[PDB]
Amino acid sequence: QAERNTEDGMSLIQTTEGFLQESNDIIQRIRTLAIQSSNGIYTEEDRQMIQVE
Amino acid sequence: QAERNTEDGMSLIQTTEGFLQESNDIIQRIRTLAIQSSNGIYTEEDRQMIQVE
Numbered sequence: 001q002a003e004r005n006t007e008d009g010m011s012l013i014q015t016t017e018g019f020l021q022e023s024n025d026i027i028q029r030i031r032t033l034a035i036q037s038s039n040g041i042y043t044e045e046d047r048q049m050i051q052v053e
Numbered sequence: 054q055a056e057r058n059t060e061d062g063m064s065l066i067q068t069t070e071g072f073l074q075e076s077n078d079i080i081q082r083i084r085t086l087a088i089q090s091s092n093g094i095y096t097e098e099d100r101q102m103i104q105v106e
Contacts, residue, residue, distance in 0.1 A: 039061055
C-alpha cells in the first residue's frame, strides 16, 4: 500500500506539472509579446491590442 | 523577435530618409533658383515669379 501511495503521489506531482507547463508557455508567449511591445515605433494603440492578449 | 524589431526599425529609418530625399532636392532646386535670382539684371517682377516657386 505504501508503494501505491507513492504512485498516487506521482500523479499529483505530474498533474501539478501539467498545469505548470500550461503556466510556462504563457510566460514564453508574454515574453514574445513583450519583445514586440518593446519596439519604440510600435504604437500605444497597438500596444493596447497586445495588452489584451 | 529582436531581429524583427531591428528590421522594423530599418523601415522607419528608410521611410524618414525618403522624406529627406524629398527635402534635399527642394534645397537643390531652391539653390538653382537662388542663382537665377542673384543675377542683378534679373528683374524684381521676375524675382517675384521665382519667389512663388
